Write a protein that binds this ligand. Structure first.
Ligand SMILES: *[C@@H]1O[C@H](CO)[C@@H](O[C@@H]2O[C@H](CO)[C@@H](O)[C@H](O)[C@H]2NC(C)=O)[C@H](O)[C@H]1NC(C)=O
Ligand SMILES: *[C@@H]1O[C@H](CO)[C@@H](O[C@@H]2O[C@H](CO)[C@@H](O)[C@H](O)[C@H]2NC(C)=O)[C@H](O)[C@H]1NC(C)=O
Ligand SMILES: *[C@@H]1O[C@H](CO)[C@@H](O[C@@H]2O[C@H](CO)[C@@H](O)[C@H](O)[C@H]2NC(C)=O)[C@H](O)[C@H]1NC(C)=O
Ligand SMILES: *[C@@H]1O[C@H](CO)[C@@H](O)[C@H](O)[C@H]1NC(C)=O
Ligand SMILES: OC[C@H]1NC[C@H](O)[C@@H](O)[C@H]1O
Ligand SMILES: [Ca+2]
Length: 640
């Protein structure tokens, strides 16, 4: 029937913005080595105002050297007394976002922590001041080295919080002159953080926002009672097809309507990680081919636009929002300056399923909606119209709708899976760049000598660490190996995921079946040290311990092994080898069909060793444990 949109009796909650997550883990990994102009174009679709997704909020992982879903991300403090604010790519990403949108909101949250913070235990709450010290340094560094103001700081992603830690974090922030930084907790469930705020006055005072993960558009009573801002601080996480776009469309509206949540943040920002890693293509768009330059501006980009391009942090929701009688919902916002945005969604059940949670079936059918602008909204002679149809027309602008009647009323015919945005704002724009190059597989012949003296990023391109951390390394005394790739962790992190017991970095095409991998390796630890190269590595990320394939190990005690698994439980071959520490060797591993061979300095070590087939996966390098080791002159030839 009719839906009243009124101002006169007051407003709803302040709108805080829409955002996305870069990190948890290494989700932006393959974006950094995109050639220009494509890399810059992708960033525009994400962050440029009145263009693409036009995001209000960017949330990033504070790397802790641990595996955090699709890879590891480097910490600013690998060891005690170590400080480096130029590792990884989150600094760069934040700067790129701020250049396009100076008003963008920045958040930081740790998934994992370096092992040395635990002081013997794998626990970040052993020394509260130390862990807070670590986190605050990251915030200080963002300002001092990159001119970044971090707006919000979290606790420990989907992990228990410590009330004394949060209080210490607040005290530490203030002590370092960061009074303006706000705290969000606890990036998990609504409980126990919500009840803890009601029971503890001192905890209530230091927490600014309650952020919950995948709330299914609902909150809980204690959260409402707190009087705190409530955010869906992580949501979405669905493959960016039309379905995922429908999911994203529905929850953007109904998170506030059903749960009073004034912000929603998607995991993840962009799918710049190998698709065969966990939750592949679960970003707002896709950019997983830096070698070709191909990127896909997926449907969720324009779903975001329907809200972001016509709302800003600081607008207020109207009291008058709700569901449509025949399915779907509507929200309305104002800036308090006479502008009005109305967002309408009619996502069907079959085309809006999220992975978390899965809604019981609900009906959606054709309907008419009549809207009447009461209060100070009674005015507004014209409204711009933007339309999207999923399943396929995206963010197309329709003809201005006029209210010269005086009734302050208008009517729409709605159908399944549609978005309408009705706004007084005239700045809307479907941004566009020419189509990027076509999809191409990872180069069947590939090499890297790691010879870069002033690298822009701390790690060689396309190498996605899945346990441990690999960096560019300059050794000035050695001439033949002055520039190498080095694994730099010397102890297991305070882990978020189940990191492997061995370090590993994967690269290439997961489809590869027959391949030849070569690399120069260097074992830094006497007697006990070990390294490997591998092919047909089929699992990574959160499942990195599950990785099977063909692994060629050599050890400083004068031995080698060939295993079917990263964990080394299953032996293909083993024996002795002329191998010691602090010496450069060239490993070659060849795999074809049922058989594999291995070479040491160009000489056959083992041949015709039967391996399981069929099987496919990436190539990789790594170390036996968390130990220093160097790699150089990497090459791979493969058949897909
Ligand atoms: C949170 O939002 C809910 C809406 O789901 C508010 O609860 C009531 O919602 C019904 C219809 O959904 C309205 O008729 C009531 O007027 C709402 N309550 C009140 C007190 O107005 C709830 O109030 C909101 N909580 C806040 C804003 O703290
Ligand atoms: C709706 O659009 C914008 C909201 O920011 C307003 O336009 C700005 O208004 C301020 C003062 O009100 C000026 O200083 C800016 O130069 C304006 N910018 C632009 C791009 O116009 C506008 O006033 C709002 N209200 C209406 C009725 O349009
Ligand atoms: C990888 O190597 C295997 C083994 O050499 C290939 O499988 C053979 O394919 C030929 C056809 O060209 C058959 O005649 C053989 O009988 C197959 N051998 C086995 C053991 O199946 C396979 O085609 C190669 N794959 C790629 C992508 O190069
Ligand atoms: C859904 O609603 C439509 C319209 O009222 C009705 O025709 C249809 O039978 C319903 N189907 C289900 C499964 O509820
Ligand atoms: O859905 C998975 C997704 N959500 C949970 C974690 O916070 C993320 O890193 C990621 O694993
Ligand atoms: Ca080199």
């Amino acid at each position: 029937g009719a839906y009243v949109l009124d101002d006169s009796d007051g407003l709803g909650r302040e709108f805080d913005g829409i955002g996305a997550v870069s990190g948890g883990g290494a989700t932006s990994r393959l974006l950094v080595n995109y050639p220009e102009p494509y890399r810059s174009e992708i960033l525009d679709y994400l962050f440029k105002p009145n263009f693409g997704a036009s995001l209000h909020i960017l949330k990033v992982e504070i790397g802790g050297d641990g595996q955090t879903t699709d890879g590891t991300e480097p910490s600013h403090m690998h060891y005690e007394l170590d400080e480096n604010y130029f590792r990884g790519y989150e600094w760069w990403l934040m700067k790129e976002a701020k250049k396009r949108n100076p008003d963008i909101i920045l958040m930081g949250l740790p998934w994992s922590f370096p092992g040395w913070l635990g002081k013997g235990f794998s626990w970040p709450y052993v020394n509260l001041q130390l862990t807070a010290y670590y986190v605050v340094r990251w915030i200080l560094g963002a300002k001092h080295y990159h001119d970044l103001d971090i707006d919000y700081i979290g606790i420990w992603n989907e992990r228990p919080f410590d009330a004394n830690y949060i209080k210490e974090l607040r005290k530490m922030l203030d002590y370092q002159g960061l009074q303006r930084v706000r705290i969000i907790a606890s990036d998990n469930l609504w409980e126990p953080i919500s009840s803890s705020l009601l029971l503890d006055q001192e905890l209530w005072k230091v927490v600014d926002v309650i952020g919950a993960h995948y709330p299914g558009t609902y909150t809980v009573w204690n959260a409402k009672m707190s009087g705190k801002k409530l955010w869906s601080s992580e949501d979405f996480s669905t493959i960016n097809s039309n379905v995922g776009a429908g999911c994203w469309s529905r929850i953007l509206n109904q998170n506030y309507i059903n749960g009073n949540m004034t912000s929603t943040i998607a995991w993840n920002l962009v799918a710049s990680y190998y698709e065969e890693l966990p939750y592949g293509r679960s970003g707002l768009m896709t950019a997983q081919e830096p070698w070709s330059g191909h990127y896909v501006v997926a449907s969720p980009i324009w779903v975001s636009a329907h809200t972001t391009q016509f709302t800003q942090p600081g607008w207020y929701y109207l009291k008058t929002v709700g569901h449509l009688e025949k399915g779907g919902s509507y929200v309305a916002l104002t800036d308090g300056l006479g502008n009005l945005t109305i967002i309408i969604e009619t996502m069907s059940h079959q085309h809006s399923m999220c992975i978390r949670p899965y809604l019981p079936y609900y009906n959606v059918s054709h309907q008419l909606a009549t809207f009447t602008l009461k209060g100070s909204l009674r005015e507004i002679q014209e409204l711009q119209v933007w339309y999207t149809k999923l399943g396929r027309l995206h963010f197309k602008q329709l003809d201005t709708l006029w209210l010269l009647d005086g009734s302050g009323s208008f009517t729409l015919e709605l159908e399944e899976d549609e978005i309408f945005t009705l706004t007084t704002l005239t700045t809307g724009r479907k941004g566009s760049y020419p189509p990027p190059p076509s999809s191409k597989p990872f180069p069947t012949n590939y090499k890297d000598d790691f010879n870069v003296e002033y690298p822009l990023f701390s790690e060689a391109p396309n190498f996605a660490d899945q346990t441990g951390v690999f960096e560019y390394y300059m050794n000035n005394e050695d001439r033949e190996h002055r520039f190498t790739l080095r694994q730099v962790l010397n102890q297991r992190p305070i882990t978020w995921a189940a990191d492997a017991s061995s370090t590993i970095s994967v690269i290439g095409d997961h489809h590869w079946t027959n391949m030849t991998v070569q690399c120069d390796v260097y074992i830094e630890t006497p007697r006990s040290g070990g390294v490997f190269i591998a092919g047909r590595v089929n699992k990574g990320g959160i499942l990195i311990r599950s990785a099977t394939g063909v692994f060629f190990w050599i050890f400083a005690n004068g031995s080698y092994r060939v295993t079917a698994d990263l964990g080394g439980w299953i032996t293909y071959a083993s024996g002795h080898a002329d191998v010691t520490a602090k010496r450069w060797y060239t490993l070659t591993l060849g795999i074809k069909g049922y058989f594999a061979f291995g070479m040491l300095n160009g000489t056959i070590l083992w041949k015709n060793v039967r391996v399981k087939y069929p099987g496919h996966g990436w190539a990789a390098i790594g170390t036996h444990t968390f130990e220093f080791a160097q790699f150089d002159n990497f090459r791979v030839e493969a058949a897909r």
